[PDB]
Nucleic acid binder design. Sequence first.
RNA 1: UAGAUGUGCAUAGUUAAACCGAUCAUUAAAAUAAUGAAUAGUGUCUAAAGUUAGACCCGAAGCCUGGUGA
RNA 2: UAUGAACUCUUAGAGAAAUUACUUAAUAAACGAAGUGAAUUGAAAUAUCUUAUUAACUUCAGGAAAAGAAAUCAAACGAGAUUCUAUGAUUAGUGUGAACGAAAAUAGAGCAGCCUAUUAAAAUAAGUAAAAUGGCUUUAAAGCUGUUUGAAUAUUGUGGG
Lengths: 179, 46, 107, 56, 74
Amino acid sequence: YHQPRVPSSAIPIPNVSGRVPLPDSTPVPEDFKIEIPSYPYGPRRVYHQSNTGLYGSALIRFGNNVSKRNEIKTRRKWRPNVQQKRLWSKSLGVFVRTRVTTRVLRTIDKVGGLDEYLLGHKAARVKELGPWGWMLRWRIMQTPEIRERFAKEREALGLPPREKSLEEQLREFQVAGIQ
Amino acid sequence: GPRPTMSGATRLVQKRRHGFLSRVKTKNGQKTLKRRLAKGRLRLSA
Amino acid sequence: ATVKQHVQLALSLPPRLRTFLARYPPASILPAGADPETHKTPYQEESPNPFMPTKHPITGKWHNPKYSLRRQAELVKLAQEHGVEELLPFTRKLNEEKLRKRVELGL
Amino acid sequence: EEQEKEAKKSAAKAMLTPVQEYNRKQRELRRARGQPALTEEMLAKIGEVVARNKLG
Amino acid sequence: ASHRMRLQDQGVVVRLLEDIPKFGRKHAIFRIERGRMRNEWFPKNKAEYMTPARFQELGLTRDAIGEVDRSFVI
RNA sequence: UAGAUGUGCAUAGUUAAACCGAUCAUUAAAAUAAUGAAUAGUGUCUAAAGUUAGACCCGAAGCCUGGUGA
RNA sequence: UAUGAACUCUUAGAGAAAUUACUUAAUAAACGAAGUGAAUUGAAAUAUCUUAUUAACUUCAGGAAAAGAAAUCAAACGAGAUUCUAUGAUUAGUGUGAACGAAAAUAGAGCAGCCUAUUAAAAUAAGUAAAAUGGCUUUAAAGCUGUUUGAAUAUUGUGGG
Ligand SMILES: [K+]
Ligand SMILES: [K+]
Ligand SMILES: [K+]
Ligand SMILES: [Mg+2]
Ligand SMILES: [Mg+2]
Ligand SMILES: [Mg+2]
Ligand SMILES: [Mg+2]
Ligand SMILES: [Mg+2]
Ligand SMILES: [Mg+2]
Ligand SMILES: [Mg+2]
Ligand SMILES: [Mg+2]
Ligand SMILES: [Mg+2]
Ligand SMILES: [Mg+2]
Ligand SMILES: [Mg+2]
């Protein structure tokens, strides 16, 4: 999709292909490329359209077109109510564009926004996300808000405080690129 | 009745239409080679 | 002499029972001057009765028992064929509990 | 090359939530405790129950 | 009347944070159309979704859900 | 050493069916009032058979799916 | 029991495979799972049905794969994961018909239990269970599913069957 620029971040919203191309204005030395961890459940082997949006567990379905009198069967299709929407991301502070089903719009309202819909750790959600949602999940995790929120939940669970962030690497490439 | 359809035929068209590369580089060509390989053919193409 | 024969009888039990009793030892076999509150194995601290569901304190969600009702009946059946059924914790699959509930309440 | 493939399968560890990290850490501690052992004192008290319910 | 009707959505529960006029005062809970919350209020940080977790932290319950007050004016 | 274990068929009939039973069914209550139905099975071999499988043998035009060729 | 050598192509790129140009470049079939899914045929025609969760195609994967330690079955007694074979069974049942067709249980092959899984996973599961509607499967249940909606908290009887 055509995504906006994050207000105060050099990392753009990933491409549905999984690539994070950086503008030439961002001085990055070759031998470097942003790599997103692979999606655990792999891509969807059917309905590849679902690998580029937030489709939940919805796919294209096949069945019959039973008639009235003789009940003659004829194959047909059932498509999900997919729509293109701009969804607010409190973490990024912009409108993330993506194709989403109406059932996933309700879940987003149920969990409390798009950011909350991506940070779920249950197995059912990671499957519903898909390759695309896995990228948006990776992106919001690079923000300072989620990094600060997770750092506060680690001490609450009794974990040690928590190497260099990606945003910092792109910052160090500037200071070293000009001189 | 049969016709002389090989009159004026060239061997550049044979290689393009039935040659080895015409088949390893396509999805349906790979099946042809794998079918002929299973049967034991020596001549897999052309 | 008899003490050595007793240890041999216990060591002759199937590994499945020796394992369970090792991590869920009842007060009967504990030392004489022992106390149930202490001497608890790491498993008994997580779940006093592994056959009953437990409500996690932090998260108000019931945790399934460490042994399903099918696996509970297998231990009762295995413990009854070796004479250690009275060493298992409370279970709705115990032969005495199944019978007591039928005689007391009936159909 | 084999080490790069390994690190790739382990790349998602950076995308773990704090709860996921908490549970993965408890296993390392739980697995370290080991299995409780039956003392010869307790094994004897178990044999008394076996013989009592088998012979008398 | 009938024993079965078309299933409709009443709305989403939200708690205001900016004292929106014509809808309610600050910290007011009620059900509002999902479009206004999803497109107007949530982006501008004017309200927040009331999730079951949010209720516990605030100590409130489902009994606090009020109604929209079209007569409210700051 | 001992114990248990492993398809099935028959041994009781009757009715739509159960209760019932050398009797049962219909008779809206029943009753020798009337009518129908009761006594060696089981396993194996040989052979001939019914049924389902290509099913005694040979023979279409055509239909569908996947590939090939300008 | 060790050991020297072991060319070219399939198989860097490109190309008219066994060439070019480079370089210590390299993996068929069958079998598996899911997705999609006919027709011949039978009903003495033919639409439901049957043929048939078949053939075939596509994707992904390993030496096997898949499945798997009960939100399972039973019936007032109890059994105790999955897989393969036989019986149960030309059965219950479905269908106007033609035909289609289980499970419990039994026997045998194997047998293994677990979450601290002998490889590193859960803070015990919510847009889920379930409902209406359109379909699949099917005996009307259960199970799968597009659309629109949408719960509860454990035998001190909460949830599924
Ligand atoms: K598609
Ligand atoms: K009889
Ligand atoms: K029901
Ligand atoms: Mg001609
Ligand atoms: Mg010519
Ligand atoms: Mg509306
Ligand atoms: Mg090549
Ligand atoms: Mg070469
Ligand atoms: Mg006919
Ligand atoms: Mg029948
Ligand atoms: Mg549960
Ligand atoms: Mg459902
Ligand atoms: Mg149903
Ligand atoms: Mg259900």
